[PDB]
Design a protein around this ligand. Structure first.
Ligand SMILES: CCCCCCCCCC(=O)O[C@H](COC(=O)CCCCCCCC)COP(=O)(O)OC[C@@H](O)CO
Ligand SMILES: CCCCCCCCCC(=O)O[C@H](COC(=O)CCCCCCCC)COP(=O)(O)OC[C@@H](O)CO
Ligand SMILES: C/C=C/c1ccc(OC[C@@H](O)CN2CCN(Cc3ccccc3)CC2)c(OC)c1
Ligand SMILES: C/C=C/c1ccc(OC[C@@H](O)CN2CCN(Cc3ccccc3)CC2)c(OC)c1
Ligand SMILES: CC(C)CCC[C@@H](C)[C@H]1CC[C@H]2[C@@H]3CC=C4C[C@@H](O)CC[C@]4(C)[C@H]3CC[C@]12C
Ligand SMILES: CC(C)CCC[C@@H](C)[C@H]1CC[C@H]2[C@@H]3CC=C4C[C@@H](O)CC[C@]4(C)[C@H]3CC[C@]12C
Ligand SMILES: CC(C)CCC[C@@H](C)[C@H]1CC[C@H]2[C@@H]3CC=C4C[C@@H](O)CC[C@]4(C)[C@H]3CC[C@]12C
Ligand SMILES: CC(C)CCC[C@@H](C)[C@H]1CC[C@H]2[C@@H]3CC=C4C[C@@H](O)CC[C@]4(C)[C@H]3CC[C@]12C
Ligand SMILES: CC(C)CCC[C@@H](C)[C@H]1CC[C@H]2[C@@H]3CC=C4C[C@@H](O)CC[C@]4(C)[C@H]3CC[C@]12C
Ligand SMILES: CC(C)CCC[C@@H](C)[C@H]1CC[C@H]2[C@@H]3CC=C4C[C@@H](O)CC[C@]4(C)[C@H]3CC[C@]12C
Ligand SMILES: CC(C)CCC[C@@H](C)[C@H]1CC[C@H]2[C@@H]3CC=C4C[C@@H](O)CC[C@]4(C)[C@H]3CC[C@]12C
Ligand SMILES: CC(C)CCC[C@@H](C)[C@H]1CC[C@H]2[C@@H]3CC=C4C[C@@H](O)CC[C@]4(C)[C@H]3CC[C@]12C
Ligand SMILES: CC(C)CCC[C@@H](C)[C@H]1CC[C@H]2[C@@H]3CC=C4C[C@@H](O)CC[C@]4(C)[C@H]3CC[C@]12C
Ligand SMILES: CC(C)CCC[C@@H](C)[C@H]1CC[C@H]2[C@@H]3CC=C4C[C@@H](O)CC[C@]4(C)[C@H]3CC[C@]12C
Ligand SMILES: CC(C)CCC[C@@H](C)[C@H]1CC[C@H]2[C@@H]3CC=C4C[C@@H](O)CC[C@]4(C)[C@H]3CC[C@]12C
Ligand SMILES: CC(C)CCC[C@@H](C)[C@H]1CC[C@H]2[C@@H]3CC=C4C[C@@H](O)CC[C@]4(C)[C@H]3CC[C@]12C
Ligand SMILES: CC(C)CCC[C@@H](C)[C@H]1CC[C@H]2[C@@H]3CC=C4C[C@@H](O)CC[C@]4(C)[C@H]3CC[C@]12C
Ligand SMILES: CC(C)CCC[C@@H](C)[C@H]1CC[C@H]2[C@@H]3CC=C4C[C@@H](O)CC[C@]4(C)[C@H]3CC[C@]12C
Lengths: 553, 553
């Protein structure tokens, strides 16, 4: 297998992997939808007890097994079905993640203008309802130039009444997505890249942009209200279950657990990489980045509330287009809006593409370790993955493609990834054993995990994942894009898409049971024991059939 | 490879293969849409000059190459891309052919009743507009019990305004299609069947049913008008180009040319089977069956026109549901309608399933000869093909699935199959050579083809195929289900589906050119010469680069 270069394996380079589109785009709107302040406590809790333990576990598993997202379960075939699952989950992300980058690309095409299109009204897409503060509603107040440009000048949402009538893909977004998938193909057709300019620029540009945004927000008039709202904890929202689900999903998106990216990345690392320090640094940097991003978001929200004289909770939307409304307007206030807008759009395109490459690599590395034919047909396989994503994403660039994008973001990567990571934790801590995992970590790095890590991997994280799965399944809420209630059939289609990845585990356990020849004992042994230890099936020496294995702790 | 049993290889068994759903369902409505009488001349002409020559050519090619639908082009790689094409074309058929059988299955569920649901009004699905002759419009007159039961009680077309709002799949049609695909899987998971009861009953039941229908129609009052209309030739319709396209498509559907069924069937035949006599008998029996089916259809049309006092051209629809309106009502007139209806529905289910098995075999035999992995994973591969068809066909059992079914029947199997068979004829008669084909036929059967067959394979059939392709592309007409004009985007989607199979040829020639290593000369030689004769590329002895090859005649 290949190995990453010294540039990306540096101690000060992991921060480059810490940045992701979820922390720049998804975390802002998730926190705004959850109120702000009431979302940081569940986020930090799931990071310290669930996110970081699963992060370390996936890193160690990928470093040990030296396999992709699916084959990494060579120690227990009965859980191999979850691998493909997360792969499909990653594929689901490609159905919408690539759609967002192209959006920023269109903004790039709107960035080379003296007068920015999101500054004032009077353009073609601007409806008569467009309101310019320099020159109406307490529900969402979508009558701002930045919102009119995003909904009518980019997505053309005014030409669609709902998800039932999506329309036709806009030619602008069509060409943008074509350029995006072409770059994605030409940046991955030669396998992994030891060192690249793309991963190098994503380590300094995002932090600089966030610092500039913070310095601008702390000086904007009226941002004090947003700052105070961000530092206010609403316990009645903590009593609700949606906040915890959103925090878990955001943690899994930011850290990458549940997509196969971590295992694929660790499969090409060295046999002595200290994943403990890497996990600590990643968690800390991600928490700090999320905190400062939420602070800047609430500062911009307070500024817009002061400028438009609208309430903070009703000044902008709570969907996937929030960062395309708040961030641009602030750039309009800074001197030289053109240069800052260009820099911000280039940063978005960079982090967006770096995330798509990481996610697509997880799909390929896994499917090639499954089928060695695809290992040699990389350029043809890459094309298939990218081209399939481009097509199945043509749905999200239609006049009403934002609805399908939100549906995929809510259901395709909702309870499915939670169930996947729960099955992974169960298969690693119970079926495989915490003792064997600790011995592997010791023989790889030189030290055994403490009581805390093992108790989290075996008891804390699985229990919390089961809890969030239960509250996601039972306490379900209908999807609404802040104004439009999705019809019941849309929710049924979303649940079916989620089940498409969820039921991959029992389907595989059924297949692994029928394909295996022998009695029930032999079938169960071949399904729960590692391949290289299959000889122990002949000697009738199975650890999982002993009480000491499940009581290892 | 396997060999067919003596029961299906008998001289009096080829008639069993002569019967098909196209001659029982598609030919009736195609002839009714084209007027009747003006359609038999183009049909017979395309059968005698285009249909039978291509039939014999495909039979001989499949018997010689001993390969599937795609690999049969081992003599010329540059045309291998057409193989997959026709395979996909066959797959396109599976998107709607399986939907029709299930319909008859529902009729079977409606056949075990004393009072047939298509006899009178008063039921739940029957709208207030239902008219019973025993107890309105000159456009289509869809107010008959048999039409109300088909459009509202089976397809539920009243719950859909157009193709834009298809709706949700009916649970009745859902279970019917599930049973159909289950039977299709359990009847093909063990490869080809040397002898089967299904292919045995399809050789006597269809002819008996057609004879009974003829005897009933010749005695029905008012059928004389339909008989006279069927024996009337409208030359102004022959001047039009749509009649010729419909005749060519019906010939290709009845004979199987353009789907890979003939090549796959001949691949398992013996090395001495006289495909000349088989082609003659098949063409004759198919022509006689089409003639008698059209005669019975026009007799029933005249009877219904006399009973309802409506014009013959406006008494029924011109879509895929004509045979579900004309044939049932006649059964209502015969004594013991229950038994005859059950027999007719069982015959339809039989011929319908026999055609789906033949078409699916063409897809599998071909894809397995392409990839020997799928040869061993037959039950898993079969499942994939059948399951994919079942899903992609869920679209045609929706409230407005008849529109998508008609779109697929018109575009997915329209100009695409014409271009495919044209490319096949060009690759066999010009690139491969008529002389080599004649030598192969001589060494297989013992006699060389006459001047007529070679002139048809080289000059007549390719010219007529080019002509019908030109008149299909230039002289295009918008699709209408006899009342509803399909929107332009529907026609664009149909043309895109057709191009999906059409452009598979240049895509493959491009791939075969890039993958081949060497200069332009070596690439062209490896792309136009047979694999086993690739050594001739080294000796620089290429027949296609000689004037005598293209002037073989
Ligand atoms: C939403 C319902 C889908 C039901 C479709 C159910 C087939 C189940 C075959 C199956 O499970 O075989 C796998 C290998 O097959 C694969 O690729 C992935 C199969 C997963 C298909 C999901 C597609 C979803 C869009 C397991 O094969 P293996 O025995 O582990 O290894 C074989 C070779 O790949 C490497 O050894
Ligand atoms: C509607 C646009 C599709 C563009 C997608 C374009 C890929 C083109 C690969 C290609 O052409 O490789 C083939 C083998 O690949 C296949 O299966 C069938 C590929 C056809 C895909 C059509 C799917 C349509 C739903 C040829 O491979 P080969 O070199 O002849 O043999 C390889 C092995 O199969 C047997 O030797
Ligand atoms: C020693 C370990 C270092 C380390 C630290 C942090 C990392 O980041 C991990 C995250 O950013 C991974 N994203 C998560 C979101 N996407 C998912 C996706 C899926 C499909 C298409 C597009 C996007 C994928 C990207 C990382 O992974 C390379 C490695
Ligand atoms: C020596 C030769 C004897 C012979 C004579 C006539 C034959 O019939 C040939 C035709 O009926 C073939 N149909 C054509 C229509 N369908 C297409 C289809 C595709 C996909 C799904 C369902 C249906 C496929 C079926 C034949 O092929 C077995 C062999
Ligand atoms: C085709 C293979 C790759 C699987 C594709 C999975 C995803 C992309 C599919 C599964 C179900 C699909 C949805 C089903 C129905 C509708 C309603 C329609 O009015 C717009 C498209 C929309 C919203 C589809 C978008 C794409 C979708 C979400
Ligand atoms: C199976 C997947 C991976 C590949 C094939 C996907 C194809 C069949 C899908 C993907 C996106 C789809 C398009 C999405 C939206 C529209 C706009 C609508 O007004 C007409 C149909 C049209 C133009 C669809 C045609 C079919 C389409 C191109
Ligand atoms: C090969 C099949 C399965 C999939 C084809 C996918 C691509 C080629 C198709 C699917 C939907 C298509 C789009 C549908 C509608 C429009 C709007 C109009 O401005 C024409 C171009 C444009 C923008 C089309 C471009 C091509 C398109 C994106
Ligand atoms: C020789 C051994 C390793 C077998 C190799 C078989 C490989 C090449 C086959 C078997 C399973 C196949 C996959 C099964 C299903 C799908 C989903 C479909 O939407 C796109 C193609 C794709 C992704 C196939 C690609 C080719 C594939 C990976
Ligand atoms: C709509 C979008 C997704 C289409 C993308 C098409 C891409 C995948 C295709 C189109 C043309 C292709 C190229 C055509 C020819 C060559 C030269 C050959 O020596 C190496 C491969 C290479 C360089 C191909 C790589 C893949 C390629 C760039
Ligand atoms: C599911 C939808 C998106 C279609 C996906 C098509 C993909 C999976 C298909 C299209 C063409 C295929 C390739 C065609 C031929 C070969 C050569 C063979 O020796 C190994 C497999 C390989 C390399 C195939 C891999 C899978 C492949 C790339
Ligand atoms: C219910 C459907 C839609 C989803 C789940 C289907 C699963 C359970 C089915 C579908 C096809 C099945 C396979 C078909 C054939 C074989 C070969 C046989 O020698 C062993 C069992 C095995 C390998 C089956 C295992 C179970 C299987 C994979
Ligand atoms: C997914 C892979 C297997 C390819 C599928 C090809 C066929 C089945 C696809 C290609 C384009 C599709 C059509 C594209 C758009 C529409 C309009 C929508 O209002 C109803 C469905 C309908 C009419 C689709 C039916 C299915 C369709 C015809
Ligand atoms: C790629 C192919 C072979 C397999 C996957 C096909 C899937 C994605 C398609 C095939 C038929 C589709 C369904 C067809 C019609 C409807 C009714 C509509 O009101 C909601 C969506 C729904 C329920 C679709 C959901 C997605 C669907 C199930
Ligand atoms: C796995 C994904 C990709 C495809 C799933 C396809 C099957 C399982 C889905 C697709 C559309 C679904 C149908 C959509 C709507 C209805 C109407 C209502 O009476 C509920 C059942 C029924 C009839 C569903 C049954 C299941 C169904 C047929
Ligand atoms: C070892 C050699 C022979 C390579 C074998 C690779 C085979 C198993 C692979 C390569 C090409 C693949 C196909 C490529 C594309 C598609 C279309 C998709 O909608 C369903 C899966 C399907 C039909 C794949 C099935 C698996 C497949 C046939
Ligand atoms: C919705 C429809 C299409 C689902 C069809 C599912 C079919 C393909 C699946 C479901 C259950 C499967 C069976 C489950 C178990 C066995 C026993 C094994 O020793 C041989 C295969 C066999 C007999 C499988 C054959 C394929 C099978 C019948
Ligand atoms: C394109 C849509 C309909 C999905 C189609 C999925 C089909 C093509 C996939 C699903 C599971 C796949 C199988 C999974 C694993 C193996 C074992 C390998 O050693 C040879 C290929 C084989 C036997 C694959 C053949 C292709 C396959 C059957
Ligand atoms: C334009 C797109 C959408 C359709 C047509 C794509 C065709 C022309 C492209 C897509 C991917 C391409 C392949 C990608 C990579 C390679 C490997 C290289 O060593 C030889 C050429 C070859 C084998 C290319 C041949 C041409 C190819 C098959």
């Amino acid at each position: 297998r290949e190995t990453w270069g010294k540039k990306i394996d540096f101690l000060l380079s992991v921060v480059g992997f810490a940045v992701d589109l979820a922390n720049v785009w998804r975390f802002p709107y998730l926190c705004y939808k959850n109120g702000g302040g009431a979302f940081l406590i569940p986020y930090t809790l799931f990071l310290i007890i669930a996110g970081m333990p699963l992060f370390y576990m996936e890193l160690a598993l990928g470093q040990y097994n030296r396999e992709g997202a699916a084959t990494v379960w060579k120690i227990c075939p009965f859980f191999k079905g979850v691998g493909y699952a997360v792969i499909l989950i990653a594929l689901y992300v490609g159905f919408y993640y690539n759609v967002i980058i192209a959006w920023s690309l269109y903004y790039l095409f709107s960035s080379f203008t003296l007068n920015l299109p999101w500054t004032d009204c009077g353009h073609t897409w601007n409806s008569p309802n467009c309101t310019d503060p320099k020159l109406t509603k307490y529900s969402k107040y979508k009558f701002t130039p930045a919102a009119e440009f995003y909904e009518r000048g980019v997505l053309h949402l005014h030409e669609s009444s709902g998800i039932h009538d999506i329309g036709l893909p806009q030619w602008q977004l069509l060409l943008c997505l074509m350029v995006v998938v072409i770059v994605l193909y030409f940046s991955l057709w030669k396998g992994v890249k030891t060192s690249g300019k793309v991963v190098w620029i994503t380590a300094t540009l995002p932090y600089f942009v966030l610092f500039v945004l913070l310095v601008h927000g702390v000086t904007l008039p009226g941002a004090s209200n947003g700052i105070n709202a961000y530092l206010h904890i609403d316990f009645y929202r903590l009593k609700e279950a949606t906040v915890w689900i959103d925090a878990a999903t955001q943690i899994f998106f930011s850290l990458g657990a549940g997509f196969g990216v971590l295992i694929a990345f660790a499969s090409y690392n060295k046999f002595d990489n200290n994943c403990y320090r890497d996990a600590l640094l990643t968690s800390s940097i991600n928490c700090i980045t999320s905190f400062v991003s939420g602070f800047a978001i609430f500062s911009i929200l307070g500024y817009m509330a002061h400028e438009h004289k609208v309430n903070i909770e009703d000044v902008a939307t709570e969907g996937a287009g929030l960062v395309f409304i708040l961030y641009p307007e602030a750039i309009s206030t800074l001197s030289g809006s053109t240069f800052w807008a260009v820099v911000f759009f280039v940063m978005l395109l960079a982090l967006g593409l770096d995330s798509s490459m990481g996610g697509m690599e997880a799909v390929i590395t896994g499917l090639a370790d499954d089928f060695q034919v695809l290992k040699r047909h990389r350029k043809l396989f890459t094309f298939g993955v990218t081209f399939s994503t481009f097509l199945l994403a043509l749905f999200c660039i239609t006049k009403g493609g934002i609805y399908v994008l939100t549906l995929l973001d809510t259901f395709a990567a909702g309870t499915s990834i939670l169930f996947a990571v729960l099955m992974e934790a169960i298969g690693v801590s119970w079926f495989y054993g915490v003792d064997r995992f600790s011995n592997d970590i010791q023989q790889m790095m030189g030290f055994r995990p403490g009581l805390y890590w093992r108790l989290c991997w075996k008891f804390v994280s699985p229990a919390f994942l089961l809890f969030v799965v239960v509250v996601s399944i039972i306490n379900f809420k209908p999807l609404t894009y802040d104004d439009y209630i999705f019809p019941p059939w849309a929710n049924w289609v979303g649940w079916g898409i989620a089940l498409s990845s969820m039921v991959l585990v029992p389907i595989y356990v059924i297949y692994k049971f029928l394909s295996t020849q022998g009695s029930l004992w032999e079938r169960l042994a071949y399904g729960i024991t590692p391949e290289n230890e299959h000889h122990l099936v002949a000697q009738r020496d199975i650890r999982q059939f002993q009480l000491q294995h499940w009581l290892a702790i």
